[PDB]
Each structure stands twice: as structure tokens, then as C-alpha cells.
Design an enzyme around this catalytic site. Structure first.
Site, short mmCIF file in Angstrom:
data_model
loop_
_atom_site.label_atom_id
_atom_site.label_comp_id
_atom_site.label_asym_id
_atom_site.label_seq_id
_atom_site.Cartn_x
_atom_site.Cartn_y
_atom_site.Cartn_z
N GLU A 134 37.91 36.88 44.57
CA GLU A 134 38.79 37.41 45.62
C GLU A 134 40.12 38.03 45.17
O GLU A 134 41.17 37.73 45.74
CB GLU A 134 39.01 36.34 46.70
N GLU A 149 27.44 34.93 48.24
CA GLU A 149 27.72 33.89 49.24
C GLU A 149 27.25 34.32 50.62
O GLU A 149 28.02 34.34 51.59
CB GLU A 149 29.22 33.55 49.24
#
Ligand SMILES: [Ca+2]
Length: 303
Positions: free
Chosen positions: A116, A232
């Protein structure tokens, strides 16, 4: 037999206590859900609790499934004690963390070095924030010095391991894809990255952006020549029907893309991250939902 048993790419899942039952009957690759985050291992400075990470690694090896280490550098679930240390001491702690993981786990299939960077850099001083951005050089000259330093450390300490960057809300827009690829571009000047990960949680794949736009952005990421991993994946299930429809609409676009070398679901049983949104594929009573019935048949038909 796992769903992707005869496929050319893996179909894995986040692994942990609630995801454990029947895991190997469905999935053929894993990511530790929480145990590999730095805050999980070293909540107290210089004592390492490897128990949960060991559990995931031991299980992966026993079932001969690839292990993705999640995650070296992130802006959440980092140790609390590091936040107030001087950058020089923070950096030594980061390097020690890298060396420790490398020593203990020599058979990592994919090392998620930074998660991220566009969304959650380790620059906050809140709970689990880490606040160690400056220990890695901050933004620096390129704007992404800290990412470069993270991958440099990974190369040094994991000289035979495939290195991956991961993020969310990438393929939903060309602008985000271009931003992410700027980081990849900077990394490739020193050949620091081997794989590109995109999470693709339910909030990333909603129908207000057409799946064809996601496909176009997958093409854009693929133009780097690097393998793509969907890391994910989840789809919400307020009704069985909505979850089924979304799986039919979204999953094939990622699964059938030639540059996608694997998909990992972010859980499949209740207790997964998006439990509230009923993203699980198996109910509390152990029964399979229509989306999972479809998924097995779909994956078998698409090797
Ligand atoms: Ca330490």
C-alpha cells in the site's frame, strides 16, 4: 483436491485460525493473514513471537503450497516501540527485521516487501503506524525513496527471493495505475521488483467502473513484463445471488488474464476481514454458497 489443482496458476487464500478448517481441500497457496506483520512478531522490542507465522509457514510446507510472506513494510500493525526512536535506530531495527525473516524462512515463494505505498505509507504515529518513513529516506528525490530503500534491503537480505509490491484501488482507474507504475518504473531502474500485486477487495471492483477498465489496466501493468498477482480478492454477499453475480462478472477477468500468475482470496470462511459484508464463501454451518459452487466448476473449466 484444491480448486486450482490442474490449473496453470494458483488459487490461494489468506491463512489463519478461522480459515484453517478444510483449507488444503480448496486452496493451493497461502498468505498469512496477520502473523507476518511486524507488529505481530515484535510487539515488544527484541523479543520475536514467531508462533503464528511459524504456523502458516509449517502448514504451507506440509501441504507443498507456495508461501507469500506478508508483509515487511506497511503503515498498519507495526510495532509501537519503534515510533519514537531516532531514524538511525529505526533503520537498524528494520534491517534486523529483514534479516530475521530471511534467516528463519528460506523457502518464501513471494516476498511482499511493501504493501500500500499509494494508500498507507508507514508515516503515521497512531496505533501500529510505525512512523518510520524517514528511517527509509522519506519521499527523497524521486518521491518514493522509502520504497526504493525497502526493496534494496529485501534484495540484500533475500538474494534468491521473488520480490513483490502490493496495493489496492489500482485497476479501477488509469490514473491510479499510472501512479503505481511510476513506483514500479523507479524500482526497475535498479531492477528491484519481480512481481506486481493488486489486492482487488470488494470495494475495488464495484460495477460503477466496468470490468473492461480493470482489464485495460491489467494490460497496462502487464506491459512492464512483470508477472501480476491478485493478492487479496473478496466479493461481498449480502445475498447469495449478488455474490454469485459478482463472481461471474469479476473473477474471470482476473483469472483469464495471461499476465496474472495467481489469485489469493482474502479468506473464505466467516471471520474473514469482510465478514460484516458476508464475503465468505462457506456459511457458519459449513455449507458452500452458490458463488463457491460456481467457482469450483469455473476454475476446473479454465486451466
Ligand atoms: Ca529488533
Amino acid at each position: 483436491a484444491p480448486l486450482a489443482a490442474t490449473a496453470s496458476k494458483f488459487l490461494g487464500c489468506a491463512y489463519g485460525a478461522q480459515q484453517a478448517p478444510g483449507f488444503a481441500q480448496y486452496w493451493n497457496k497461502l498468505t498469512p493473514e496477520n502473523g507476518g506483520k511486524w507488529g505481530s512478531v515484535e510487539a515488544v522490542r527484541d523479543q520475536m513471537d514467531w508462533s503464528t507465522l511459524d504456523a502458516a509457514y509449517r502448514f504451507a510446507q506440509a501441504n507443498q503450497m507456495p508461501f507469500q510472506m506478508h508483509v515487511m513494510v506497511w503503515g498498519n500493525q507495526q510495532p509501537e516501540w519503534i515510533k519514537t526512536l531516532r531514524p538511525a535506530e529505526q533503520r537498524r531495527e528494520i534491517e534486523q527485521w529483514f534479516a530475521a525473516v530471511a534467516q528463519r524462512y528460506p523457502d518464501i515463494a513471494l516476498l511482499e516487501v511493501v504493501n500500500e505505498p499509494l494508500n498507507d505509507p508507514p508515516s503515521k504515529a497512531d496505533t501500529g503506524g510505525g512512523n518510520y518513513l524517514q528511517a527509509l529516506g522519506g519521499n527523497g528525490d524521486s518521491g518514493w525513496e522509502w520504497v526504493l530503500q525497502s526493496f534494496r534491503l529485501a534484495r540484500r537480505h533475500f538474494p534468491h527471493t521473488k520480490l513483490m509490491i502490493n496495493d489496492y484501488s489500482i485497476t479501477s482507474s488509469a490514473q491510479a495505475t499510472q501512479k503505481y507504475l511510476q513506483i514500479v518504473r523507479l524500482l526497475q531502474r535498479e531492477n528491484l521488483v519481480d512481481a506486481i500485486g493488486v489486492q482487488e477487495h470488494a470495494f475495488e471492483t464495484t460495477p460503477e467502473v466496468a470490468v473492461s477498465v480493470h482489464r485495460d489496466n491489467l494490460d497496462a501493468l502487464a506491459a512492464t513484463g512483470l508477472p501480476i498477482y491478485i493478492t487479496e480478492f473478496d466479493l461481498d454477499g449480502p445475498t447469495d445471488a449478488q455474490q454469485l453475480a459478482d463472481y461471474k462478472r469479476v473473477f474471470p477477468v482476473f483469472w483469464e488474464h495471461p499476465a496474472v500468475h495467481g489469485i489469493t482470496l482474502w479468506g473464505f470462511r466467516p471471520g474473514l476481514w469482510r465478514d460484516k459484508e458476508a464475503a465468505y464463501l462457506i456459511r457458519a454451518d459449513g455449507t458452500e454458497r452458490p458463488a463457491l459452487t460456481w467457482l469450483r466448476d469455473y476454475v476446473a473449466a479454465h486451466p
